[PDB]
Design a protein around this ligand. Structure first.
Ligand SMILES: [Zn+2]
Ligand SMILES: [Zn+2]
Ligand SMILES: [Zn+2]
Ligand SMILES: [Zn+2]
Ligand SMILES: [Zn+2]
Lengths: 293, 196, 417, 445, 356, 31
């Protein structure tokens, strides 16, 4: 009914995609998702003539805005493509080429953490700027992540993703997630989709991605209330402990810092805020249930 | 007329009496009512026992209504003789001395409102004859008396009082008084160095 | 004092007061206390706050104020009075109460008493108005005028006390006891008449002063300093906040229930670069028609479940009859109340409540039996048509009750034997 | 109304012509955008899969709340024959048109397009200086000739003929002059997008034997093109069609290469104010507008007295109002123009008036009247004055032998809705000239 | 010089924002909102009237407070006819309080206010609260006089003994007893007694009251609270809820007694266990790890990029550099972003993107 | 604006009862 902005955040990392190719029998599967995303963006632009497109790539050493251009060309797609569609696709491919060159130069750099949270925050900031500038535009976030590569530690991603969830809920900006890899579910991203009215999808095979993109992640903000989401997974809205690394259904959270704990911390002292708990108070919770003698 | 009935709804009424003990108890009651937030109004004589030492600061004194110039009784033989003696000896005019005597008590009552620089109050002189006595008020009161307030109306004075109280109810900026009205040891040393 | 857990639980009058007014609380109470047999103290233990709120509603009174001044008579004149104002008048003027109690049942009724009081000079004197000799007043009320004088003397003695030297005006006049000067002019002395006696205007001033003093003193009922007052606060050191700072360290272990090298990574990167520069076919995105059907089947498989949940995501309309539904709700409510009490006593942590825990466990077992009996009754009456629906309606509470009993049994097995 | 009008015209076209119309991806890209959002979603779902999906599966996607929207979407999609319903094996399978599917696939995936969108000469021109000025001037000339204000360069015989043959701009040779009508005023009240679409639709209906599919190919491709760039020259009919379109100020020719203009992009989708005016209780109008088009259209129902650079001042008079009404303009349309061109001062004062009304009586939500009710009352009263005298053409029936026959004839006339007046006491009645023949035939029978 | 005046005013505004420290704040709050409904509230200084504007802003405050403090609780008291009337019991349901305010807005205010009565009622309402929660009372006072039956100083002493904290928002002028209350009840701090100057400043004060108050160093109540995270259930048939005894399509299952609850966060009606979701706790992490302020870069030095890092927007070119940087990551940000990252978001995109 | 108009011219009671009876029984039991 009204124009909507689509901000696609793609987590393209050589380490992430090499593991996918090695575990599978598909070589260069990254290209497949590139052209699948290109056709998806063309379809989004064909939905209406007043809708914009933004692409943010999260590479090893940071983030980059593939579209629109920064601070103001090779032929990779036929020039017969629609002028508006090509104006975005050619720039996207050129920035992909430049990004690959830049990251190839620093391939030896030891990056121990991903940048998906920063990419999501940048996308939200871009949505805010465009909405404030133009006046009466809807917005939508898409996150294409490669989960095949084993992650080092996802704990540090918890807080920023939750803040992004809150901001998206304030701006009524659904965020959808598409995961390509081995793990069937990503707890944090699935929580993001469920709490922001998004769509969480996990696909094992890179081929035929356009079907999923067109049938599942094509719900524009105008008809979200009238379209039922295809998500199948169910979340628990739980969090892992702080010193045992297990999901806790019932536990103790420190009042001062609201840090979760499955069991009483050793030494009767919080391991995060260095706060000493009262012995008399802590004994009460340690007391066992009452049963007749 | 029933005006005291209207006053009673908003504040308690305490009245100065000839009995010194009763007046002291009235002062204590007025202070208690001002402290507990009930709100109180104290009626006294400008040349009475309260104005000769009792001080109203902070919560105790907020508004001072000087109802008329506290002129002495002109038709008094003692005062007339004193005026004649002063005119003959010190060459002081009778009107000048009478105005001085009244303005002195008016200022005496006015000055019992402020203890420090964080205290505030509204001082209304209700008489047509104060309009020409600005030059006779103390210097620190004359400087604060603006030219637009020389002759006001009751409603306009009420509006000004409301605005002034609302303005004075805000937190003061520390920088606005850091070294211009309140001096620390370093500021005092700087003043001494600049002066020397 | 009185507003405490023990007294609120023991004040049966308050319990009978709020429950008579509140119907829903009575709805639960009738089932859980009359037929079920739950102790009233146990019932109110979890509703302490309701009792305190209902008590505070009626346990508060307005502050003292000048009522006779608010009384405006406004030829006939109509003056309106209310019970609250009558009580305020009695509280503020004990003489009126004295003349009321001894005369209302004896000589004349309350309306006549109030009319005579309003017409009398006593009301004028208590209003702080100058009494006029021309006014006739009332003969009956005037008998108390001298008693009012005596009461005023007694109240003056009640209020008199030593005053601090800071605001001691008596010391100001007694500082020099041998002062002899010129007597003040008549403008500086109380007004007097031709005959030389007082005009009476000072009396009303003293009356209003005494009224204010009495109100302030009544505030202070049964229910060093000079240095602090005289010190200049503005010149003191500015107040400094004493808030505590916190530094939150972040170090948490990962959740608990092939490696690729730089050469392979660079080789794949070179491959993708070469492919992109050489050629790119967007038409290859279209599937082969052998995987499109599978993808569509998977997506529609998810869609069916999502729609089934979404079509049914004021109480919702129900198929059961009103009587049976109400009975089911009653059973659920009583069972839930028993469960709440059982869990409270079980997790109290003190063994002194073992008898209460046992009684609540027996009550829960009886609740299970009652649920089974209701299921059987509905099964036979409705021929299984509504039995399944009722069981679905009451399924979670049955599971909770049986879980509580199972946990109690397991812990008893471990503890006792 | 934009999408509704275009969709209605496209629906009236035969299916045989639609199938050939969907050959070029350029036309498909334009037609796709006009459908409702739900229809667009379904079309995008169906385009990328080469299979048949049952209608029930599509129904599952829509929530209970949007069930109504599902009906409109499916009805609109089926009206254009875009979705071909095939029933077999007891299931009402739904499939997409193969030509439409292939066209969308080519457009989206950059497949073979046969240069439907055209080529680029890489010889750009100054759009602001030349394209904007040319199109603005030409559109202004046509609109000026429509509003009737004198203008030197009269429009070409092509557009003049289209105007006359259309309901717009009624003309009579006996009178020897051209005047605006009710539809003309509505056209002038419509926005630029709808103003262009109306003329283009009239041209589409006017053209006879130049293919209907070719005309839509050219129009939709023109909408596809972007302003400020060159495009080398196409169909044989499209050559003369391009020359004709140059007469509407859409495409600019040097005198080999044609350039689209701002209106070309305006065709595809949409995109103090000029035109806002103040109306006083003294029947005075002060319009803060500087444009001959606005001045001329205001002159229709305003007795202009003077003008300034920044604004135009006039007075409402019975003569001007009667002129506008005689031209067929409705008071509703006049008040619509005034309301949609109300000044911010008038809007703020009317908002304060509504706020005061609701504050005084918030129980009733009174309507928001931007301009004083007296002007509305006066205009409607003048319309009533014009409508005071009512006359009909027909014949009077009397001298009936039998009351039964009189009642029979009068009742038949009432049943066929051609009875205007009757009197039983006089046994007389009057019927319309249209129904005179039917009444006479019934009387004979 | 007007543009430079605007720039210097912006710098002065940022001066206060410069000083930010990770103060310890009590996320778990128990607030008692006391409203004044007396004859003094019939004045027209606030349009249409004080009662109407105050009630509207109270509704908005309730919405914001329960949006940003999911695990807190609120209660509503009013002052009418010199008596304190309770209109909302302490609970975690925002809808009940909103409906209570919608009911309150109708009745005309009359009578005198009673601060002592209101404070006693608030103390009684806050008596049954855990020691780990912060007991707060927000009063909207409009009158210049107080009529009380007892000694207000004794009530103030009792409040100090009970460790309750009182914030007072005045309308016209400072009241001595209000100042003494707000000072003695906040360890001598005198910044908790605010008098508004206009409608916009009243809105700003109401919004400021939302954020949790920092705790005192000497007031230690550190402890561990037993809470559980339930799992949402999707059922085919309606079932009776253990909290309201009403049929609902689905509800969260407690992990300690398996009873179902309609909405979160609420104390379980059976095991008296607090049920919350991870997002409810996540909403308060920014109060424990506030983002450090951003300082503008002087024009003397050389800038990094011509476009904003977070939004990719051209930096306006003209005297004063329109750039803001994050010291942690040293990434230039535009003025439009800075406010968004410091008001809506709570993470720096540059810091998140920088690997370690 | 009246232009189009034609021109002017010529039960809880039992619940309370059982409540009272039960409380009377309670009081008698305590006494
Ligand atoms: Zn901690
Ligand atoms: Zn419920
Ligand atoms: Zn539970
Ligand atoms: Zn940073
Ligand atoms: Zn920016």
């Amino acid at each position: 009914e009204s124009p909507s902005l689509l901000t696609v955040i793609i987590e393209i990392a050589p380490k992430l995609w090499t593991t996918f190719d090695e575990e599978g029998n598909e070589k260069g599967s990254i290209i497949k998702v590139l052209e699948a995303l290109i056709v998806f963006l063309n379809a989004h632009l064909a939905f209406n003539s007043a809708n914009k497109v933004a692409v943010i790539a999260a590479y090893s050493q940071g983030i980059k805005y593939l579209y629109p251009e920064s601070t103001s060309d090779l032929k990779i797609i036929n020039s017969d493509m629609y002028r508006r569609f090509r104006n975005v696709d050619e720039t996207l491919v050129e920035e992909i080429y430049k990004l690959f060159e830049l990251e190839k130069k620093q391939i030896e750099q030891n990056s121990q953490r991903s940048t998906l949270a920063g990419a999501m925050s940048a996308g939200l900031t871009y949505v805010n700027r465009i909405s404030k500038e133009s006046v009466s535009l809807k917005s939508r976030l898409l996150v294409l992540t490669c989960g095949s590569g084993s992650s080092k530690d996802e704990i540090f991603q918890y807080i920023p993703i939750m803040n992004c969830i809150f901001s998206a809920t304030k701006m009524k900006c659904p965020i959808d997630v598409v995961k390509i890899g081995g793990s069937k579910e990503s707890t944090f991203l699935q929580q993001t989709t469920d709490a922001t009215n998004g769509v969480y999808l996990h696909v094992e095979s890179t081929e035929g991605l356009i079907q999923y993109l067109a049938t599942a992640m094509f719900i524009d903000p105008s008809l979200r209330p009238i379209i039922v989401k295809p998500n199948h997974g169910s979340v628990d809205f739980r969090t892992s402990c702080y010193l045992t690394g297990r999901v806790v259904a019932v536990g103790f959270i420190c009042s001062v810092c609201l840090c979760v704990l499955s069991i009483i911390p050793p030494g009767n002292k919080c391991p995060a805020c260095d706060s000493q708990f009262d012995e008399h108070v802590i004994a009460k919770l340690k007391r066992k249930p009452v049963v007749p003698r | 007329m029933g005006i005291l009935d209207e006053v009673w709804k908003h504040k308690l009424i305490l009245v100065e009496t000839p009995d010194a003990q009763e007046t002291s108890l009235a002062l204590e009651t007025y202070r208690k009512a001002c402290s507990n937030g009930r709100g109180a109004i104290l009626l006294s004589v400008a040349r009475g026992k309260v104005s000769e030492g009792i001080d109203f600061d902070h919560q105790y004194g907020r508004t001072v209504l000087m109802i008329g110039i506290p002129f002495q009784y002109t038709e008094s033989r003692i005062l007339k003789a004193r005026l004649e003696f002063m005119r003959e000896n010190y060459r002081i005019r009778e009107n000048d001395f009478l105005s001085f005597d009244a303005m002195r008590h008016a200022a005496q009552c006015l000055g019992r409102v402020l203890r420090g620089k964080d205290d505030y109050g509204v001082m209304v002189l209700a008489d047509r004859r104060f309009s020409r006595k600005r030059s006779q008020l103390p210097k620190w009161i004359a400087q604060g008396l603006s030219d637009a307030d020389l002759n006001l109306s009751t409603d306009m004075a009420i509006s000004n009082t409301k605005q002034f109280l609302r303005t004075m109810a805000q937190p003061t900026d520390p920088k606005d008084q850091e070294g211009v009205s309140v001096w620390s040891y370093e500021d005092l040393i700087k003043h001494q160095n600049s002066r020397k | 004092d009185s507003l405490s857990k023990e007294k609120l639980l023991t004040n049966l009058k308050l319990q009978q007061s709020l429950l008579k007014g509140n119907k829903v609380l009575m709805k639960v109470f009738q089932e859980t206390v009359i037929n079920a047999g739950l102790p009233p103290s146990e019932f109110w233990s979890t509703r302490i706050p309701l009792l305190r709120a209902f008590a505070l509603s009626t346990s508060q009174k307005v502050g003292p104020y000048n009522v006779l001044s608010t009384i405006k008579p406004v030829n006939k004149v109509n003056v309106n009075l209310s019970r609250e104002k009558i009580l305020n008048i009695f509280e503020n003027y004990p003489i009126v109460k004295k003349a009321y109690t001894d005369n209302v049942p004896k000589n004349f009724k309350e309306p006549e008493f109030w009319a005579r009081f309003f017409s009398s000079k006593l009301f004028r004197k208590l209003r702080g108005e100058k009494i006029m000799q021309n006014d006739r007043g009332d003969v009956i009320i005037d008998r108390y005028l001298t008693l009012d004088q005596e009461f005023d003397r007694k109240d003056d003695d009640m209020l008199l006390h030593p005053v601090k030297k800071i605001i001691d005006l008596d010391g100001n006049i007694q500082d020099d006891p041998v002062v002899r000067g010129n007597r003040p002019d008549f403008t500086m002395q109380p007004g007097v008449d031709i005959n030389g006696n007082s005009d009476g205007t000072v009396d009303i001033l003293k009356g209003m002063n005494r009224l204010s003093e009495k109100m302030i003193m009544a505030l202070k009922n049964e229910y060093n300093d000079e240095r602090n007052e005289l010190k200049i606060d503005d010149l003191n050191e500015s107040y400094k906040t004493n808030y505590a700072i916190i530094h939150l360290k972040r170090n948490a272990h990962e959740k608990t229930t092939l490696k690729v090298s730089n050469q392979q990574m660079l080789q794949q990167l070179s491959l993708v670069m070469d492919n992109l520069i050489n050629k790119l076919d967007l038409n290859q995105v279209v599937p082969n028609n052998e995987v499109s059907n599978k993808i569509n089947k998977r997506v529609i498989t998810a869609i069916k479940i999502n729609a089934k949940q979404a079509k049914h995501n004021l109480e919702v309309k129900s198929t059961l009859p009103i009587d049976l539904l109400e009975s089911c709700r009653m059973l659920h409510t009583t069972c839930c109340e028993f469960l709440k009490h059982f869990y409270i006593h079980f997790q109290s942590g003190e063994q002194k409540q073992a008898s209460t825990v046992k009684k609540l466990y027996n009550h829960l077992k009886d609740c299970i039996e009652k649920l089974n009996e209701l299921f059987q009754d509905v099964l036979n009456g409705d021929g299984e048509s509504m039995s399944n629906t009722c069981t679905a309606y009451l399924k979670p509470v049955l599971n909770s009750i049986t879980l509580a009993t199972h946990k109690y049994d397991e812990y008893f097995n471990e503890y006792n034997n | 109304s934009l999408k509704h009008s275009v969709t209605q015209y496209l629906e009236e076209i035969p299916q045989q012509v639609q199938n050939r119309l969907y050959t070029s991806p350029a036309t498909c890209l334009a037609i796709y955008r006009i459908l409702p959002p739900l229809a667009k979603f379904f079309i995008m779902a169906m385009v990328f899969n080469e299979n048949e999906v049952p209608l029930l599966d599509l129904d599952k996607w829509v929530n209970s709340n949007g069930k109504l929207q599902f009906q409109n979407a499916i009805k609109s999609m089926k009206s254009l024959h875009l979705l071909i319903p095939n029933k077999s094996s007891g299931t009402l399978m739904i499939n997409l048109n193969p030509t439409f599917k292939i066209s969308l696939r080519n457009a989206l995936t950059g497949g073979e397009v046969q240069n439907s969108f055209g080529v680029v000469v890489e010889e750009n021109v100054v759009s602001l200086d030349l394209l904007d000025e040319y199109s603005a001037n030409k559109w202004e000339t046509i609109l000026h000739f429509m509003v009737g204000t004198p203008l030197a360069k009269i429009p070409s015989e092509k557009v003049l003929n289209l105007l006359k043959h259309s309901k717009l701009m009624e003309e009579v040779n006996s009178t020897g002059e051209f005047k605006i009508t009710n539809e003309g005023f509505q056209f002038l009240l419509q926005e630029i997008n709808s103003q262009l679409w109306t003329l283009l639709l009239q041209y589409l209906k006017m053209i006879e034997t130049m293919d209907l599919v070719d005309v839509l190919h050219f129009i939709f491709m023109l909408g596809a093109l972007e302003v400020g760039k060159a495009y080398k020259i196409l169909s044989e009919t499209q050559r003369i069609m391009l020359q004709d379109m140059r007469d509407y100020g859409l495409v600019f020719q040097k005198h080999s290469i044609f350039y689209p203009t701002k209106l070309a992009l305006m065709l595809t989708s949409d995109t103090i104010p000029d035109g806002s005016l103040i109306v006083e209780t003294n029947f005075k109008i002060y319009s803060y507008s500087n444009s001959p088009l606005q001045i001329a259209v205001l002159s229709l129902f305003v007795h202009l007295k003077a003008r300034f650079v920044n604004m135009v001042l006039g007075q409402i008079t019975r003569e001007s109002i009667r002129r506008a009404l005689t031209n067929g303009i409705t008071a509703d349309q006049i008040i619509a123009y005034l309301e949609t061109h109300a000044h911010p001062q008038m809007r703020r004062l009317a908002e304060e008036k509504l706020e005061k009304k609701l504050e005084l009586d918030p129980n009733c939500k009174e309507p928001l009247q931007v301009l004083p009710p007296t002007v509305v009352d006066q205009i409607r009263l003048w319309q009533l004055e014009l409508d005071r005298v009512i006359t009909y053409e027909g014949s009077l029936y009397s001298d009936f032998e039998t009351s039964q026959e009189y009642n029979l004839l009068s009742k038949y006339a009432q049943d066929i809705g051609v009875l205007l007046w009757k009197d039983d006491k006089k046994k007389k009645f009057f019927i319309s000239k249209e129904g005179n023949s039917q009444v006479l035939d019934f009387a004979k029978r | 010089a007007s543009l430079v005046a605007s720039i210097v005013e912006a710098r002065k505004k940022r001066t206060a924002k410069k000083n930010i420290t990770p103060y310890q704040r009590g996320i778990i709050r128990s607030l008692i909102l006391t409203l004044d409904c007396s004859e003094a509230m019939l004045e027209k200084d606030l349009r249409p009237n004080r009662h109407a504007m105050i009630i509207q802003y109270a509704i908005d405050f309730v919405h914001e407070f329960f949006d940003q403090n999911p695990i807190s609780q609120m209660g509503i008291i009013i002052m009418r006819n010199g008596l304190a009337q309770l209109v909302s019991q302490v609970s975690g349901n925002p809808q009940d309080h909103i409906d209570a305010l919608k009911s309150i807005r109708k009745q005309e205010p009359k009578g005198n206010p009673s601060l002592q009565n209101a404070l006693e009622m608030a103390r009684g309402l806050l008596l049954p609260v855990p020691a780990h929660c912060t007991r707060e009372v927000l009063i909207v006072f409009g009158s210049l006089s107080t009529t009380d039956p007892g000694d207000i100083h004794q009530t103030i002493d009792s409040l100090v003994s009970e460790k309750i904290r009182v914030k007072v928002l005045g309308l016209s002028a400072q009241v001595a007893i209000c100042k003494e209350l707000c000072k003695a009840t906040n360890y001598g701090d005198e910044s908790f007694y605010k008098i508004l100057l206009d409608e916009t400043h009243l809105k700003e004060l109401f919004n400021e009251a939302v954020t949790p108050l920092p705790v005192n160093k000497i007031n230690k109540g550190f402890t561990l609270v037993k809470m559980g995270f339930p799992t949402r259930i999707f059922e085919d048939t309606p079932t009776f809820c253990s909290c309201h005894s009403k049929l609902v399509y689905g509800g969260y299952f407690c992990p300690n007694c398996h009873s179902k609850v309609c909405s979160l966060p609420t104390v379980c009606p059976c095991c008296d266990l607090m049920l919350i979701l991870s997002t409810h706790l996540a909403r308060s992490y920014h109060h424990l790890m506030p983002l450090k302020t951003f300082a503008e870069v002087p024009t003397t030095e050389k800038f990094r990029s011509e476009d904003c890092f977070s939004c990719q927007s051209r930096f306006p070119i003209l005297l004063t550099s329109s750039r803001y940087r994050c010291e942690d990551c040293k990434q230039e940000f535009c003025v439009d972003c800075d406010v968004f990252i410091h008001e809506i978001l709570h993470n720096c995109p540059g810091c998140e993107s920088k690997p370690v | 604006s009246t232009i189009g108009k034609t021109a002017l011219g010529r039960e809880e009671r039992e619940n309370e009862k059982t409540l009272n009876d039960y409380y009377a029984a309670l009081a008698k039991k305590q006494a």
